[PDB]
């Protein structure tokens, strides 16, 4: 009942977390029973919020809706409610307030960027009773949540998947905005470069070989410490390559031992044939040979020589039998065929899409450190378009579009930030405030000449963490036809590339909209490279692949086409962060720590600051909530 509400909030239902011990020391240092009832009140208020997240849950409605034993200790109920409301576990997202937020607002803060992190932090700080204003360089809100809308056509160019609802705050936000989510059919047929389908047996054989290779690299790192070789951190690509080399030699070694057995039996047979012709000539020359007793003795010798010959002929029979049967049963010739390698490269490209970077750059030890915080349930796509979430989050917020910040000043006296209108950067704006929450993407902070100056310049640990962490890339091309020529029962289908070097080029195709739209991904080393290619020839290559799969007859020229270039986009400089070889999971927490030239005044939020949920939009949401909570807890 209430345990489900605790789980949905990413909390253990029968034990208090560390932040609750920090905010409620009188309980962790007290009796067990009051800890248990604290947990019950927390879970019950969470359940009340989650069962009807459309309207604000007040302390008053909380008190009135709790049941008999707990409704009387009003002060602890209010403590629990205030704790939960401060940290964004209740009254977050877009909800109808019971009383409109107060007129006078104690504290003014500017927020860089209008992404999901920025919008969430803005809404939290607004309903906390503070003055908030956003500066967004782009001409729309959401940032990396980009939905191309034209006529009947809807297509997400950035955020596109909801990675499960079990514990996901995106479940609450989807319920609030009435966004319809549809399951993804996890059936992905593959098609080779010529267009012929990959048979079932080969498909699943290569798939499970890929999985075994990945588990082998996991082992190499987590029980042999194959983490630093030659004073160099090991990538996932290195471990994959060396495990492939190991299995290729297992193949070669079994080949060698088979050849050695066969040649040794061949030598045995040649020498036995020598012995046999020797005995044959002995038998012949004796066959050519009291005289009655001599005849009888000669025959007594000849029969013995003949039984000798025939016993050895029996041994020869079983030995030629053995040679033939080992001529029949050899081991594998190649570990992977050429086509086997191409299919395995498709699976590698799928992993490169999952991490938005080439595995040549992923920390073998830490690339999947977030894995233990994944949500339960099935992955869901959005049909209304993911922009329905940022735009819905933006109503009622003081958002200044087309204002790119170029300088951020933070001193103990206050904070001044210099922004500039984008459409002609001669006009200049300047904003004073008490705090600044930066939600700039890591790609913007990484830029070769700093697109935003910081005065005083950022600390050593901050800039070092910015440089160590990885910020990957992943692109989409969407094709809008008039007719649907593909199988409407499959959401995913793959195209296997010819070369390993270009295995992530148009390797996956999505039919996740029942409107006639097809989405093709570009991941890995191709992502940052095919951005240098005009849209027309990329859609030409897509049409070539689709012609090879379906025939030149059944595919018309598309009626609308869109291409993403996220690394080129000056407001993104890539897709999402990844754990680079030199980096670790602690670098996200370093990105999360605020700066103080004294009290902290420059705070950081965004997808690259949430250790347990990076690379995802629910991570940006939760990071915005956390930073708003700490800002309001300091300034109020
Ligand atoms: C590019 C791409 C991003 C995502 C995805 C795909 C792409 C192509 N996937 C889809 C595939 C997938 C599947 C499964 C797992 C992972 C991925 C999405 C998905 O299936 N799930 C998912 O969950 N997150 C997906 N993701 C990740 C992101 O979607 C997510 O990580 C959030 O988008 C992070 O958002 P946030 O941290 O807020 O950063 P933004 O970039 O959103 O906000 C910053 C704002 O700053 C403005 N700005 C810039 N420079 C400025 C300046 N100088 N002055 C003022 N403003 C400035 C920008 O204009 C922007 O608006």
Author numbering: 173 to 461, 475 to 782, 792 to 830
Q: What's the paper's own text on this?
A:
Phenelzine and GSK are monoamine oxidases (MAOs) and effective LSD1 inhibitors, probably via modification of the flavin adenine dinucleotide (FAD) cofactor. The gross crystal morphology was markedly different: yellow in the absence of inhibitor and translucent in the presence of phenelzine or GSK. The inhibitor-bound structures were superimposed and compared with the native LSD1 structure to examine whether these inhibitors resulted in any other observable structural changes. While both inhibitors bound to the FAD domain, phenelzine but not GSK induced small structural changes in the CoREST binding region of LSD1, which has been shown to be important for LSD1's activity and stability. Therefore, phenelzine may play a dual role by disrupting the LSD1-CoREST complex and potentially its stability and activity, while GSK can only bind the FAD domain. Phenelzine treatment abrogated co-localization of LSD1 and CoREST or SNAIL and CoREST as indicated by a strong negative PCC score in the phenelzine-treated samples. Phenelzine also reduced LSD1 nuclear enzymatic activity. Therefore, inhibiting the catalytic FAD and nuclear CoREST domain of LSD1 with phenelzine can upregulate M1-associated genes and decrease M2-associated genes, while inhibition of the FAD domain (GSK) alone does not.
Lysine-specific demethylase 1 (LSD1) is a H3K4 and H3K9 demethylase essential for myeloid cell differentiation, reactivating key immune checkpoint regulators, producing cytotoxic T cell chemokines, and preventing IL6 silencing in LPS-tolerant macrophages. The LSD1-CoREST complex has been shown to promote demethylation of nucleosomal histone 3 lysine 4 (H3K4) and histone 3 lysine 9 (H3K9). We first confirmed whether the inhibitors act via a FAD-dependent mechanism by crystallizing LSD1 in the presence and absence of phenelzine and GSK. However, the crystals diffracted to similar resolution and belonged to the same space group, each containing one LSD1 molecule in the asymmetric unit.
